[model samples]
Target chain A: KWTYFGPDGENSWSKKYPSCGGLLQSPIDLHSDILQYDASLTPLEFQGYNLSANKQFLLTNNGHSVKLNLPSDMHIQGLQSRYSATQLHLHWGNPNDPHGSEHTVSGQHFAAELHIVHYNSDLYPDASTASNKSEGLAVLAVLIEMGSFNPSYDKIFSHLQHVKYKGQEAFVPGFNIEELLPERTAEYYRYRGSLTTPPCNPTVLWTVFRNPVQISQEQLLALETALYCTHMDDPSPREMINNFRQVQKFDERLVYTSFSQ
Target chain B: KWTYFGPDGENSWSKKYPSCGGLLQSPIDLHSDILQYDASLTPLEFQGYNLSANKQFLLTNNGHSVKLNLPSDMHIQGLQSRYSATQLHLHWGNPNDPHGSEHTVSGQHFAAELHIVHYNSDLYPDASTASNKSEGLAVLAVLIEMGSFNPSYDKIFSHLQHVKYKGQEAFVPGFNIEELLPERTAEYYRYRGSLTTPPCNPTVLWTVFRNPVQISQEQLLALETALYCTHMDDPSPREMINNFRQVQKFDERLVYTSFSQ
Candidate 1:
């Protein structure tokens, strides 16, 4: 199995996953010099984000990150094609090095980051079936920084204890997923990048929100220490801290921003 | 006319030079975990390396490094084929950041590096003609560290002022070229890698010396500051410092060492 550190780290991931070494990779540095303000990028409308209180979502420890499955009915509008929600996961760093946001702003990292994955439902059946195809995937990013306690984020963090080990699962009560996003959702940066993980497909259309959400230090600590990449029966369990990929080079890539500077 | 910084940096080089992003790239980290000791690796004999003191060698500022042209008569022995010397160059960092070696040892970088470029004369007529051939080129690398003054290195550094600008040339009375190499020439890490520069062909047989050579800080400062990538007529001059490329990933490749830890 591929890992985030040691012999099978990110740099060596290209050995097994060729796409990891290919062009159009993701998690790039979001600096101003490469930014282009485009008025065409209007506010994205989140449809069916508020699930019925009686419903539930499947939360699992996928050895890489804690992922929550979302219904296909939950889709994003304002893009050229309708993108249905596949799942939402997070990338973070340890308490000692809390700057773990995948995408950096002006070469600066936030405490952590969230990614709401979606697949182009207009031309494909589902995420798995659509993956690897052109314009198959889309991701909505939310940067998480240290500040006041986030009750909206607590909804997912509270389930971390139940699914701490790899392969572990927990049923999370469905809530408004839009609440996890930061304020001023209208402002965002758009670019074409790939999946940050191995088998890193270059089919992702990225949308990183300009504003960042806040989480308390205590909440950040729990997120850093609570997850384990190993199975429950594994003798040497490995902590899943710093589960983020390094920023890739911006080669002939221009990040389009919704709001003008 | 590629650069080492800004929009035309090493990362974007692949856009213009596609071979740069291809397989078997060079300048990888020489760490213990990835090292393999091979007893079959014998010491290579340097022939005609001691140049005649009466003759002068041509040195030029090639917009990349200070390159000195060596006669093809100065060749290496003990390889599968005769590899004739073509030219030699150096890569170094500025005073602020002294760690600028292209290849790192145990994840740590040395202050500078020297590359003696050669091509297989047995198969090809010359280095230029050897391009696009199997095992076309070979390079002998010596890592440079900060310590006592090295008069041998000063032989070339002393002429930097005359050829400070790009496209400038100078001639130096020949000295013993082999004196520039570090001691324990038998101990080295061998691998098949590509050229660290543009059009990075993967037909190079690399030999990086196990031990590093020492150069005084003053000499290193002169090497860093006394060179420009731009010509004197240019409106803006760019320093030739930090000329080393970042260490690349060793994918499906093993580093064979002549000496064991």
Candidate 2:
């Protein structure tokens, strides 16, 4: 039987299992799982210079994963305020298989999704922090809708040629990630959750957008082109293409949303 | 005798006044401007930088005017197509009251704005197309919203401390204008409009957002810090500080929004 426990599952998070409280733990369902997100939370704004992007800090790498240095004025609520860039990552699916997205939206999954991971500014002073593992972290999850061309998704597509793998890094010389965000930032469904992996720290404050990000089939294919499906040890590089966690369900916890019933 | 030519002062749009055309020339209330905007007739999409905000050209100031070099892929939209970067300039309000936002939402004008002007790609086939004025040109207007801790704005801000006159020039560094955008670019409101200035080419497309950038009162005051509003040689310099035109009537144009109406 395939072990439900992920690699390096010996930590407290894995041991806790069903009770770890990871917002994105496996077994999550679209509508039910969202109840675990944390509402009323605010992400620290970041801006700075980057040598790689050849521009100042702006939203680059599309919604998949943006790399930007934190501006001095940014502050993470409750958490310690530090100035470190947060790398926002995305979860997408193949056009033929649209259900592959990571986090589900109101019971609906899309071809692709995103995860905005930021260093807990409250814990870490700047990027380069070793403790950053557990410090300031916020995941802004996004789902991609199928369409002709995604103006916002274009940010990620344009940089695919540059990022080849997991360790690969690029600079978002700079643009406004805010501009690409839905007008309803102040209102989002929230819940207490945990990191879906390793330590699975039950510290995540899930902020999944109620709206979906629309991108064309061409853009989806464009992203898959850059992703590697398998590892070198595997005979056929199955392309670590579709990496995600199944949506989990919450028993009685209230899933608060920015939208009112 | 002052000429009162109704709202459609068609004669004023001639070569004599190049930056005049399309939807009531800015400085109007974004709410009314957009309320009057007709999305049905407007194209869901218009020509602009591929959501990527990619730049195949780089522009730097070398006195007289800023200079820019373009790559093959990047070019002007219509006629010329492959245009390169040339020079850039600023359009703003009077020194006493600075508000020259290129793209306005409602009637609020951003204190100062920067326009990185570029020419058609095919014309010169080279990056530095400063000398090539003809062919066709595209201007990337970067709105600079004043704020207390905006270090990025400070870079250009301090450089402008000396140009106390309206016609003064601040040859800023060859920075990537894209870096100055908001974080959520995917949620931008775009529409088709014309250049607010001379040659008033209706063919040129516009991608103005429907959000107002934040700028502190002190930051706003800093902009007028340099320009000596009173001792301006040419009335144009004084006119530069207060160059914004009153908000014009929408006249039934559609303001395409990125979010769902």
Candidate 3:
């Protein structure tokens, strides 16, 4: 398994996993200057995002980040093709540091970033097979700004207590995933980038919202302090912090904005 | 003398002013995602900003936009060098349109913007000479969001009716310049850019506040519908609907912030 720092750090990941060093890597800085106002872009259409109480989602601590496995029935529209939800995960900085965000705006980093991953179901049967294709994936990226308490996130943060160590997992009560998104869905920056981790396939259609969702300090501290990068059996347990990758160069890629920026 | 649109627009500005097309340009979208938090950045210190009613200030309606001249005694400290306030101005959009702001956050435009222009008296003798150098100017840019009436701006907007056309000028009773600024000066995006208008010199150290100032709908309309881009001798009167320059590209320069955004 790959770790975020030390011998298995991001720098060494590319050696072990060649795709990690690919050209169209994930988590490139979303520079506003390069973004073009595309009036044609439409709002995201999601289905089954609101799960009933009977349904549940799995949250896991994978030593790299906290990932929530989404239901396969959930799907998103408004792209060139239909994509089914695969999973969602979070990348955050240290509770003390302010640069945990994978993507930055004009060089300004946020406290955290959320990524909801999906794959083209029309062309492929599953996310794993579509991960290597150019037109196979669509991701919804939401930036997290630290401010007043966000009760919507409480659905997940409240249950993170169960997944404290690496490989630890828990079942969370399902809620409306749309509530986790920003208010304005039509306003976003769309571009082609790759998965931020190892086996970084350049096959994703990235939609990052212009507006940020607010999270309280207390809630953020829980996320920052609870998770661990080291396994339960490790000689010395290490807390997970800065689980995000550095932004890569975006050469000649056109970033399109849904609304006038 | 330059206008924001048409033949002598920003596209043609480089012919008359070479620096207009320089690498470092102003009004670049201060994207919130890419800002770097600089703990060393201190609060802005203003000197001689408050004036008694006995002392009046000049406000003018240039063909391009509205400008307010400041007293030479007023200065700002917090940067590497001290900069004296020379003048302040505004850039706004039509009342019908929601986007008129020069700077954008993650591509989301604001209703209007206020610029408090200052020159580095510590280095150059005056603003004109400093306009041609690398580090001669420092501008405080604050975005304007439409909301409840802001009495602070009434000191200037209430008198806008007096100077509705190009070359029109007026004198208003003095008020506190601090009122025109946003409450939080500590959270700002700092970058090396030029004046938004031509001769578009790359001499300004821009500090754009993260938070926006507020103004009533009526005040915004006064700024939008009341101003004209045409002179008194023009064939047809042209309304100064959008008095903002297009965002310039920031190639290699990094935008820094005073706080963790």
Candidate 4:
């Protein structure tokens, strides 16, 4: 497993994985000038997103991120193509330094960011195989900002204590997945970029919402301070802060915006 | 037919040419971290660059800046393809603020810059149509610095007095094109960017020399004071100072350098 800092950090990732140094790498600086207003893009449509409270779910500390698995029934439709949901993960920084968002807007970093990954169901059998194809994955990124209390995030934050260390797992209480997304799904910046993680495939169709989801100070603190990079069995403990990668280049690609603004 | 400032400046360029306002516009700020060392990029090669002393070229004040028309026979290679030389232009600021280079290095502007434009002869018919297509143009950029007298540039500067007014053109005695280029042509930052001028096509394969060429204080003043934005027939005359465009965003792009440093 990769750590956020030191010897096994981002600098060594590309050596073990070639795609990590690919041209279309992700987590780019979302500068205002590169964005264009696209009239054709419609509001994002979701299927089976509002999961029942009794549904089975697994929340785990994967050493790299805090990931939550989703059922196969859930999917998204916006490009007139169906992309089946797979899993969602988070990247955040320490409580003292809240600007750990994977993607920055106008060079302004937020408290954190979320990634809801999906596979192009119309073309691939599953996300594992689809991750290798150029037209395979579709990721919906939501920026996290600190503000008033957001009960929607409590569903995950309250249970974060259970999976505090790497390799630890917990059964999560079900909640509407839509609540985790931004209020406005239509307004977003779309571009062809790669996965932020190792084996950074350039295939993913990225849609980062323009607006941000708010979280209370305590919830934000829980996200920053609760997770550990080391497993519970390890003698040494390492705080998993600043797990986000630095912004990559925009390299000759166009970024389209759903709204005129 | 565009001026560097006032109503016909960069802001109004897109109105006349749609491509001028594209996302992958050129003259971007080159940060050191954004660049990767690529050993695969071979040294730049030139053909018919050493012009005969008896040969002639037209050096003219084009109402925007001083431009020199190159011979059609000149070409360059070593980019996995051949690029036919077209023409070259210069951009500069006034004596007060000598840093007028279109592209900046780590947010620091240079005194002036030179652009040697070429077209992909393997695919495109000419620089005109090639300027609109991706992978159709190649530009060699040289940054200018103030130091000692550079006799190499005197071949053009000695004749600038003849083309002081707009609409004026002077027949320049030929000099070796290699003299205008920096000594270390092998060390450069290569990337895909658009033309610095209007109709900013994203097709250009840019190679900006890492080492800057030195110009004497007198030579810098000659370049800055010798050109006029106003035509010879205009009611009011305007000095063509700060003729460079602002830096564009480095949208998800990779900048490859021949050397690690």
Candidate 5:
């Protein structure tokens, strides 16, 4: 019922998804003034980001986006909340306008963005039940730009062709998923925001890295071009381009940063 | 009811103003890839940017924002659409202690933004008659930041206190409105978008400058706290802070840039 264009666009989402209009919306403009340094913040230890090479993770075109299914065992060790992995997804812009990252830095957009979503296993028992809790979700966001070619990213991009259309699925042999994260992971901005998608329950805690990861322009072009929001057999195909929500507004809430000026 | 806060905020605006949920909404995040270089485009040739130092202009507190009336004779040349000036307004992040702008560069926000609106005088008689036309309205947008002190802006800022309440009005002797803009007016991003206010009809085209003008932090603070959204006798008073609409999604749209980089 909701899309990113025409009548059913984001401006109309609140009509169907009440929570889309609620507080603590995701993908806010990260700024210098809104930031406050928190001394107590610590680094996260990636427990099992390196899924076994023999194991396979499901990657799919969820009609509007590209998502990779994750194992619940891949958990973070630093936070008070025990959040295990659910899935990782991407948001991108099209060839004509390729700056499609959901979260922005200093009002600037990187080429793209990655969101590794997790849920509180300890508090809610499962990801579905955790959807409504105050602190039930956590997202590790990595901003993407065009620079050097990333081999770690290619492992996943290699299969994008197979899942080019919606409802189509592909399998990926798991490598070191932690390799996907940017260096200096210790420095980040932390806040409690909602899911960037619909039914935006404001239950998630966000940790967006300060540094950006780069991929070659060729690699980025593939990510930008190789997808469809429509099904394989649909006569009217909607190319899955610019599949990202606009940045939301946040006020009064103090966003905490790990590093100080 | 079409305000930027609480139940009557931007989220509920679509209910009353159906066009608020329509296509080509204004105030988009300007970023690379989405930006196409258009060397063929020429400068706007600001015709009557000088509002005449001897004349006085009316400044009003219109509940939601601060508006300054512009003379119709103040038009821009060198385009198929001869757009004449109507009025100018400001959009910032917050009401009290504000620092976010309407148009963004990449996902980044500027301290504030200024909007100089115009109507296609060659095609239509007045701004009201031109409101529903395809090429009826055009806006010259300037990004603002805090750094060096700007005396030109202070001309309007000095009178902000007098029109502090809604419906309040003041008069200021005219100055060179062109001085209010940033240097090198040659560089900007042009795209089709709507008004960032209620009844956001997508009839406007925008010209957002590449360079930003700076004001002192003290000056920014005054612009932040110098206005109210309530009448002098209203029981409930609201600060006129953070009046920018969240950047709308830009789908199938190519924002043309004048400068190559």
Candidate 6:
């Protein structure tokens, strides 16, 4: 993606997509980028969590954030230790629109993207650092698309009525973070790229899921309702859903999708 | 260079030789693993502030660090603004012979290695993110070898008489950082690697100076004088400085030694 964030102005999107020359822009199908690319490839083991099949996280709005105990076997070989969980945030476009996720996987973009920020265990104490790019972070992006229902998100969705603006806070008394992941973890794409925002360090080992989790359109609107505001920095506080760019070329790098069937 | 660190278990010393064999090793003395190798090259634009150039930083006794204004410029093309200072630490060998610097220019390894960490502006507000790796950091590794009668480090050196433990506090009211670097910025090697510590994600854009910055042997001892009890988990403090690893192989990668000759 050719830097699409407009810090204080209107960010143009069409210019980034070649009308006919390049490969089609995002919002792609489930299994296209895997044609010439390999899928079952294993990275240097960069996932920082101690994934436990026996354990799944719960989300609550009681004031405490949900944390997970990362597995040791999750680190990239030449990389460092398995990172622990830190905080989670959601990003979407200005107004609710189709193709809303930050990364367009297999040419497809979701309605909203959930980034669970996990700092590398190096520079950060518990996986949180100032905004320095190399501060050792591992972010997992969970794409949210429009659909009917998934009650698991109710813990976070229910609190939408409370948050009203930028510096708002919510209480997640006791939350398990794992419930947000898709049940089908098999299909996905893995690559190296940068953060979509400032300090866009290309140091990430990104894993974008091939399948998506469903959330009703009404639920999305509820989140938008809570986020509406007019600030000194932003004149319009309509709805920031679908804030993502189409995936860029890999510079002929390998594209790996985990699903074979 | 491998992950071998200094006396305190933080800094490192490495060699020009490959861990595996490739174009991507530290202390690039040009043995041919990388293609398009050019040694007489210089960055397009270079900018650094007094704080970064000087090296001393402001830190609360509790480990809360706030570096003052740093240098910046369009030095690395797309990466614009950048600022980074140093942390007080070192690397070494079996107490008698400490090898903790990463870049090995000639046959010499410095008494210690000091890293002035900078973020890639194109990737982060600072090198602070765990998820975004490629855009997170850019480090300048300075080799500090043993010498005689070097008095510039007296600011931090004097503090050794008092704060002799971890979490102990003593501040130098008037310390200058720029006095640390060598006069010549001529010969050097460039490569990529990970943080020597845990979660060793390969995100560094490393530059090792060809020449060594001299520090008196007594000064080196003074630098490590702040010896505190090891953490509760460690078997012994001896296990700490054992932090360095021999520089990893370039996987047949190239080490680019940019020189003026």
Q: How well is candidate 6 docked (DockQ)?
A: 0.01
Find the 10 residues in a row with the least total lDDT in model 5 chain B.
B91-100
**Candidate 3, residue A163: lDDT:** 88
Candidate 2 per-residue lDDT over residues B1-261, each given as its tens digit: 001121212223331333342332332334432443333433222234222333233333221122233333333443225444444444454344455564554324577665544555564544334222433444544566655466544545556555554334444443443444455444444444444444344333344444334555565565544444333454533212333333333334555555554
* Chain B TM-score against the true chain B, each candidate: 0.98, 0.57, 0.95, 0.96, 0.97, 0.67
Candidate achieving higher DockQ, 3 or 5: 5
- Per-prediction TM-score, please? 0.59, 0.39, 0.53, 0.54, 0.89, 0.38
Tens-digit lDDT track of model 4 for B51-136:
77798899888877788888868889787778988888898867765677888777566889999989988888888878888689
Please write out the lDDT profile of model 6 over residues A163-183, one tens digit for every residue.
Answer: 544434455433444566665
Instruction: Put down candidate 1 lDDT per residue, A1-261, tens digits, no spaces.
Output: 777765466655666677776778888868656789999999999999998779999999999999999999999998899999999999998866676789987546789999999999999999987779877999999999999999889999998999999999999999999999989999999999899998888899999999999999999999999999999999999999888886765545789999997
- Better-scoring candidate (DockQ), 4 or 6: 4
Q: TM-score for model 6?
A: 0.38
lDDT of 3 by residue, B1-261 (tens): 566545455545655666665567667656544567888878888888997779989999888878888987898977778899888988887766645788877656688899998888888888898888887989999999999899889899988878888899999888998888887777888888888887777788888988999998899988888878776677988888778765544444678888783
Q: Pick the candidate with the highest lDDT.
A: 1
TM-score of 5: 0.89
**What proportion of the true contacts does each candidate reproduce?**
0.00, 0.00, 0.00, 0.00, 0.60, 0.00
Name the candidate that leads on DockQ.
5
What lDDT, from 0 to 1, does candidate 2 have? 0.45
Off by over 4 Å in 4: B1-261
Rank all candidate structures by their TM-score, best first, as comma-separated numbers.
Answer: 5, 1, 4, 3, 2, 6
CAPRI verdict (incorrect, acceptable, medium, high) for model 1: incorrect
Q: Would you list the C-alpha lDDT of every candidate in the order shown?
A: 0.88, 0.45, 0.80, 0.82, 0.87, 0.46
DockQ per model, Cα: 0.05, 0.01, 0.02, 0.03, 0.52, 0.01
Give the count of colliding residue pairs in each prediction: 0, 95, 13, 8, 15, 120
What tens digits encode model 5's per-residue C-alpha lDDT throughout B1-261?
Answer: 477877677866786788889888888878665789998878889988887889999999999889999999899886787899999988876544456688878666688999999999998988988888886999999999878989999999999999999999999899989988999999988999998998888889899999999988888888888898999898988888889888887756889999998
Q: Which docking class does model 6 fall in?
A: incorrect
Ranking by DockQ: 5, 1, 4, 3, 6, 2
